[PDB]
C-alpha cells in the first residue's frame, strides 16, 4: 500500500520535473515538439505501470 503510494507520488513528481525541463522557446520549436512527444510517451508508459 504505502510503498506503492509513495512510488506513484515519486513517479508523478519525476514526470512533472521532465515537463519542467522542456520549457517552450523554427528549428527550436521542431526540437521542442519532438522532446514533448517523447516526455509524453514516457509519462504515459510509466503511469500505465501503476494503472494495471
Amino acid at each position: 500500500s504505502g510503498d506503492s503510494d509513495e512510488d506513484l507520488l515519486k513517479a508523478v513528481r519525476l514526470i512533472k520535473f521532465l515537463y519542467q525541463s522542456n520549457p517552450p522557446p523554427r528549428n527550436r520549436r521542431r526540437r521542442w515538439r519532438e522532446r514533448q512527444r517523447q516526455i509524453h510517451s514516457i509519462s504515459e508508459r510509466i503511469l500505465s505501470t501503476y494503472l494495471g
Partner: antibody
Framework: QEQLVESGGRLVTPGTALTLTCKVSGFSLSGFWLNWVRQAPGKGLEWVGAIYRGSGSEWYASWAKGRFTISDTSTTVTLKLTSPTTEDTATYFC????????????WGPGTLVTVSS | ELVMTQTPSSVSEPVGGTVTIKCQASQSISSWLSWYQQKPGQPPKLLIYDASNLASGVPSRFMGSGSGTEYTLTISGVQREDAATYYC????????????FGGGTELEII
C-alpha cells in the same frame, strides 16, 4: 567525451559502511538516469538502483532498499552500502542512460567490493 | 517486481550457425527491452535497444524482436568473437515494477 569511472572498491568486514563513487564526465545532457549494476564473481548482472541526475529522484530494486543509498553530487553519483554482508561481494558498475528511454549506453569499468569476516 | 526469464542458460554453436536467445517479461514492458554482450574482465556492451533497433557499431548479424511478452535475440552468422555471455534488460527505473536483467546466456562457439 562521455565517461564513467567507479572508485571505492575495498576489502571490508561485514557491517562496515562503504561508499562507492561514479565520476561523471563529458556528458552534454543535464538530466539523465545514472544506474548502479552489480555482478557477484561468476554470476549475472543485477540492477541495484538509479537516480535521475537533475532531480533527487532515487529508485531501488526491492532487495536494495534500506541497504543502499544513491546520492547525486555536482560531478559525481555515489552508492553507499549502509551495512554490507558477504552476499554483497561484487564488482559494482555505474551505467548511464543517455536518451531517457531506459537502456544503458555508457558503462564504467567497475569497482570490486569484497565482504569477508 | 519485474522478472525477466532468460533462456537458454548456455548455447554451443559452430561458426556460421544461427543463435536464438529468449527473454520473457513477467509484466508488459512494450519496447522497454535492451540486449547486452559481456566478455570476461570487461563491462557489458549495448547490442539492441527499444527491443528491435541495432545499436551504433554493432554487426548486422545481431537482430532483436519482440511480440507481446516474448523477446528474441538472434545472431544469424555466429563468429568466434561472439563467444560471450548475453543479457536482456527490461522495464524502467520509475515503473511500478522497476527494471531487471535476465539471468544471462553463455554462448560458446564450436
Amino acid at each position: 567525451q562521455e565517461q564513467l569511472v567507479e572508485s571505492g572498491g575495498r576489502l571490508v568486514t561485514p557491517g562496515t559502511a562503504l561508499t562507492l563513487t561514479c565520476k561523471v564526465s563529458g556528458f552534454s545532457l543535464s538530466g539523465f538516469w545514472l544506474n548502479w549494476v552489480r555482478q557477484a564473481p561468476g554470476k549475472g548482472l543485477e540492477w541495484v538502483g538509479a537516480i535521475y541526475r537533475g532531480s533527487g529522484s532515487e529508485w531501488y530494486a526491492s532487495w536494495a532498499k534500506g541497504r543502499f543509498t544513491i546520492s547525486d553530487t555536482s560531478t559525481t553519483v555515489t552508492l553507499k552500502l549502509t551495512s554490507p554482508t558477504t552476499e554483497d561481494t561484487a564488482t559494482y558498475f555505474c551505467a548511464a542512460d543517455t536518451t531517457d528511454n531506459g537502456y544503458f549506453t555508457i558503462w564504467g569499468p567497475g569497482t570490486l567490493v569484497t565482504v569477508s569476516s | 517486481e519485474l522478472v525477466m526469464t532468460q533462456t537458454p542458460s548456455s548455447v554451443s554453436e559452430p561458426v556460421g550457425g544461427t543463435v536464438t536467445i529468449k527473454c520473457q517479461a513477467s509484466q508488459s514492458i512494450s519496447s522497454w527491452l535492451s540486449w547486452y554482450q559481456q566478455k570476461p574482465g570487461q563491462p557489458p556492451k549495448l547490442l539492441i535497444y527499444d527491443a528491435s533497433n541495432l545499436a551504433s557499431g554493432v554487426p548486422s548479424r545481431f537482430m532483436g524482436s519482440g511480440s507481446g511478452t516474448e523477446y528474441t535475440l538472434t545472431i544469424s552468422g555466429v563468429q568466434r568473437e561472439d563467444a560471450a555471455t548475453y543479457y536482456c534488460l527490461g522495464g524502467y527505473p520509475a515503473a511500478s515494477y522497476r527494471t531487471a536483467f535476465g539471468g544471462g546466456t553463455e554462448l560458446e562457439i564450436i
